[PDB]
Nucleic acid binder design. Structure first.
Lengths: 442, 273, 442, 273
DNA sequence: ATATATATATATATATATATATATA
DNA sequence: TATATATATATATATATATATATAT
């Protein structure tokens, strides 16, 4: 029986230092590298677990969200359901990481079906841009089966567009076009001046202009008569449920306009006819300004880049350029790590293939006789030769057809191919490889 | 007034073959917006469960928001006939596909999935036999499911109503029997085959680049052997339907047009009571 | 555009018919063969899915219950949680099929811990009896991944003890000893008269007797003075929560006795002090009857064998003897099916091994030279000889060390072993195989 | 009266070191029944989080079932001293483990996990220095955690009270500090360290056939490599323990004997809110 | 033409048996 | 008095690419 004398201050400190670990694995701040909030990281890891065997199979969203609790996600399965539902569509993401089969929503109506009906899988975008996932850092919490963060080759934190409001901190990033982000990353890699990546919202036909840092996200319209106008786009912040109930409802309530729906397969649409009681300014600029202000067609968005570095700390950036630079640096280090491990692995593979080719050549010629040598009497004989130091377990134990004439040459060809691969991996740097992985995004 | 979640059709309220879709849930209404014919098809989402309404008490069941919105959209009002039929005139008989059918000069005939006026059929070089009204068998006329009286004046905003529910929500409570119980307040809709039900396929089989739809599991089990190499998807709800399949099912719909039996007033008590 | 004419009778009847298929997978009536209610079958199938790899790894009960919805279980996850919790203990089961790691309860307190804390896995009992799973019938519903029923060698429906009440039906079976059930099965299999298997409850120290068909389940007790007795067992229907609150608490309230708890590791116990108010009968039999009635030591249980038979129908049996007879018949059928398929499988295996041995013995002497030819050249050449018809892909394609002298005999040894296995599986009947499987239920 | 869920001890209410275990959940109480000894260890299960007990009327706390049963079992009553200490007498000072210790003739000394009377120590041939009461440092006397006064008369049924809760509920809700806030109404329990809290191991490592218990993750990570081939299991709660480990933890317990700081009243209005 | 989307053959890391040493009541 | 692993060892099988090919753009 031990009688320790822990004080109440230690009790309070230790109890508080578990709500400071229960609200940090659920911090709605995207990681700098993979752009994943922890719930999205768990969903992606679960969808990668389910994608083993058939990458193209669509798994139920209920299954994907129910399997996250076994990977170390200590929050509800509804959170994983909603993360997958918002992650598996195309209207909300420039570069969606999950594919979708079912009704995942649209810009018009932004709610997915029940998680039991909609199916999802990791898209070709994920496998295209998320590489070196075997070198991703292991989490400090050993119950966190997914890594500390994944390793995309471009800062996916900008592509899809994040918005996280937490206690004491808030992040807000606008979706950037994939091509501009790729070009900025290439410029940072080579060492050139990085041009500001342009903001491009997914499935948005309007226009975005940068003024004083703030972004004017403006809808577009076209006039068909003196009193008939056609709204052919609205700002990305709207959906038909809230556009009608915030802008068009008061307008038709005051008798200004009469409108009918024109939505469809081509986004939004609202044909509008004005009334006499709604005065139209004769000046073109005044009319355009009052239409833009009256119809909610202009929204201003301010970017607040609050992300979590590779060190696990909270970092705030003024402009996305330095985000690109630091991400390029850390991903450059990880590509170097991949370079080194691949160098050693291809060297070992080349040595093994060379030993295999030599053994096949000698047994075809007849130098090494495998006839009438039992099992633990030829193995130690092979162990004597230097080339077969630790390869005998794999050298005698390979199939018989390797000893024919056709596959004897095929083994030497693979030996030379592995030697060439080793030379390639030991000649290039991070610049060359991080570049080569960059032209395989489109 | 204006119903919020309702999606008004362009021709709604006119003399056009409009349709209203009482889709289950607010998620599929977006797919409807994407795929609907803007001129004819309307829409309204049902975000709940059994709507009761078999207990009557018009005021008590007008408390339900969904029922009130449906009444506002369709133009239906409880306790009043949905539409007034044309006055009886001259009766005519013709041999339709080898079957003797007795009609009147102002009905409509369902031919190949389309409803054609009596005058149009007369103008189409079809033989018509004039028969005195006293010599017309009303019992035979009422039994003809391919003949419906032409509407003289209608307060209905939509010419049809198409229910649209999930296959997983069958038996374990539903809105389809509940919507049926609500729509029974105007039997004239069923007499003309107005209230319908879009048959969502239960199994969608992808035979290469083509698709075959099976509305029952037994049909697929019987027809799977003759099918070529294929992969199937269990469509347990409208949410599992892709937008292309939703459009193929909206623009080319198959309707289980509910017909009231001789004892509809009694058959709705065994389920809801 | 089609227009069918459903008549509200095919609507109402089909709506009621779909509520039928939803209640034939939730009826609390065990299958006569495997003794499984459908939820228990789904739990067992899920725990078998998780037991792939490490069979001894304890999986969380929350994981086991959450994985049943993907196997075709349309009811709640709490149902699977409770089924696993009740299956995985030893107090409630004479022959448990799930193992346990944690607080799964006891007879004293019959409540298991939270499903997130307790772990479970399929026990060695399951693998002892539940065999021929590859020959279990495939369910008519293609979303029912578990089979129609499993195939234990003994009627597990009697061992653990089932109790369920359905819509218009109810089942009640008493837990039978594994040894008596196995002996009855052996008697039925060999054609002898079947003795009624005796009823024993798991972790029960009392006695059970049979009069007028009903079972008198009595708890034992012992006296130590004229007013002091030690209750050393109570009927299986009690727990310390209800035995205290339904017998001892009322007796305390009436002032008859004063008692103290004695429940321990061994089981139940309640030492009782008798007061002057509690009248003591001079006659020993009258005193014993008064004790057995006042203290609730007597429980009478009536057996109602309502079991879903092989055809999927509801069969009510008069006595457990006929259940054992019919079960032995149908399991005889399935053991014969296994015998036939194993005959056809081991014949092909024997001929493959014989072809392998012949090829090795020929290439030892150089009859089939592998050098100087191509793989496509050798495959066709080997396809010419009669014994190498479908084995060429497995004949040239087996490892090199087979062409030694020691491993050239381990192939002939396996050929002889497969010939012996063919003899054993083609000269024996279902009787012998069912007998052999019955002698491994220790 | 009596408490239903309470499990009495044989010597409860007598002069013995009987302990009452406030298990979280009704499941762990079965393991407690199986592994406890009948003489000393009691027991009572707590199902959920006990309601806050800070800044509330005595009637309000007496409404709660769990708090009322705690008061009934422990012999404790709100607003009244838990026990009355012996009258102060002659003061004696000795040197224990090279440290000067000042006690009375009726005090308890905590040596090697056991409380030994002053009279027993005097009978153990240990030198005692008689010191006048006016020349005794009370501040140093009250700062010794291994010295406590012997109780003359006590209304407490159990000598000590042990808390036993799940390890995944320490911040994701709270059951432990709420119990501490309730027990704070009798500070004399803490001044002698009556209120305790057993340490459920966080990681149990099976090194072959033996077992090693790690009470924090950091200790296991530090000692992970020095350990031999072993398997571990995260003990996320009491229900995750087997009966043998529960017995090894009850019969050989380690106690976080909580101590009230100089401003515990102010510190309790931090997590309560 | 332009990927690209499917079908198809290959090494390899599990799941399953495959043999057989290690020990608690 | 048996136990129980238990540790290499096979194995066959379910994978994660590599690549041939019909294909929409």
């Amino acid at each position: 029986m031990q009688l320790n004398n822990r004080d109440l201050k230690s009790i309070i400190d230790n109890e508080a230092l578990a709500y400071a670990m229960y609200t940090v694995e659920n911090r709605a701040i995207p990681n700098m590298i993979d752009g994943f909030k922890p719930v999205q990281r768990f969903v992606i890891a679960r969808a990668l677990d389910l994608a083993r065997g058939n990458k193209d199979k669509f798994h139920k969203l209920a299954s994907i969200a129910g399997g996250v609790a076994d990977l170390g996600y200590h929050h509800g399965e509804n959170s994983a359901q909603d993360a997958g539902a918002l992650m598996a569509n195309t209207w909300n993401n420039n570069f969606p990481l999950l594919d979708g089969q079912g009704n995942f929503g649209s810009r018009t109506v932004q709610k997915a079906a029940a998680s039991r009906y909609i199916f999802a899988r990791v898209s070709k975008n994920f496998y295209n841009v998320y590489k070196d996932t075997e070198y991703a850092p292991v989490h400090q919490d050993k119950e966190h089966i997914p890594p500390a963060f994944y390793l995309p080759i471009i800062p996916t934190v900008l592509l899809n567009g994040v918005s996280g409001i937490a206690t004491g901190y808030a992040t807000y990033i606008l979706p950037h076009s994939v091509s501009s982000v790729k070009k900025a990353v290439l410029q940072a890699l080579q060492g050139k001046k990085v041009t500001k990546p342009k903001v491009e919202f997914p499935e948005f036909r309007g226009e975005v202009v940068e003024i004083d840092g703030q972004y004017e996200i403006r809808g577009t319209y076209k006039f068909t008569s003196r009193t008939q106008m056609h709204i052919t786009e609205i700002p990305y912040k709207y959906d038909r449920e809230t556009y009608v109930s915030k802008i068009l409802d008061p307008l038709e309530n005051k008798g200004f306009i009469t409108w009918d729906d024109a939505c469809g397969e081509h986004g939004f649409g609202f044909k509008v006819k004005f009334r006499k009681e709604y005065s139209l300014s004769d000046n073109e600029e005044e009319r355009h300004a009052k239409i833009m202000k009256d119809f909610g067609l202009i929204e201003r968005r301010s970017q607040n880049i609050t992300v979590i570095n590779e060190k696990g700390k909270l970092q705030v950036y003024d402009n996305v350029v330095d985000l690109i630079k630091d991400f390029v640096e850390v991903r450059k280090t990880y590509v170097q790590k991949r370079i080194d491990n691949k160098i050693k692995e291809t060297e070992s593979a080349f040595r093994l293939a060379f030993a295999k080719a030599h053994f096949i050549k000698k047994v075809i010629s007849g130098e090494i006789v495998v006839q009438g040598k039992t099992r633990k009497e030829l193995t130690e004989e092979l162990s004597k030769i230097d080339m077969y130091s630790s390869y005998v377990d794999k050298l005698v134990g390979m199939n018989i057809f390797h000893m024919t004439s056709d596959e004897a040459k095929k083994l030497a060809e693979e030996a030379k191919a592995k030697k060439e691969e080793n030379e390639y991996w030991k000649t290039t740097d991070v610049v060359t490889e991080y570049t080569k992985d960059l032209e395989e995004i489109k | 007034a204006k119903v919020h979640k309702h999606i008004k059709a362009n021709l709604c309220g006119k003399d056009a073959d409009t349709t209203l879709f009482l889709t289950e849930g607010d998620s599929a209404i977006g797919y409807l917006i994407d795929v609907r014919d803007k001129e004819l098809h309307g829409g309204y989402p049902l975000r709940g469960k059994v709507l009761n309404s078999w207990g009557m008490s018009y005021a008590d069941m007008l408390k339900n928001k969904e029922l009130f919105d449906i009444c506002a959209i369709t133009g239906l009002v409880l306790g009043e006939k949905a539409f007034e039929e044309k006055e009886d005139g001259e009766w005519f008989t013709f041999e339709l596909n080898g079957d003797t059918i007795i009609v009147n000069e102002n009905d409509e005939v369902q031919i190949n999935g389309k409803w054609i006026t009596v005058g149009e059929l007369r103008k189409n070089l079809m033989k018509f036999v004039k028969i005195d009204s006293s010599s017309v068998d009303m019992k035979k006329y009422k039994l003809q499911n391919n003949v419906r009286r032409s509407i003289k004046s209608s307060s209905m905003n939509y010419a049809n109503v198409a229910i649209m529910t999930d296959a997983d929500h069958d038996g374990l409570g539903s809105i389809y029997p509940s919507l049926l119980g609500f729509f029974s307040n105007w039997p004239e809709l069923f007499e003309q085959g107005r209230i319908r039900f879009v048959k969502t396929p239960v199994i969608i089989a992808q035979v290469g680049k083509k698709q075959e739809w099976f509305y029952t599991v037994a049909e697929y089990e019987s027809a799977k052997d003759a099918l070529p190499k294929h992969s199937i998807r269990y469509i347990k709800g409208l949410g599992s339907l892709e937008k292309s399949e939703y459009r193929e099912m909206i623009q080319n719909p198959v309707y289980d047009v509910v017909k009231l039996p001789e004892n509809w007033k009694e058959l709705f008590e065994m389920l809801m009571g």
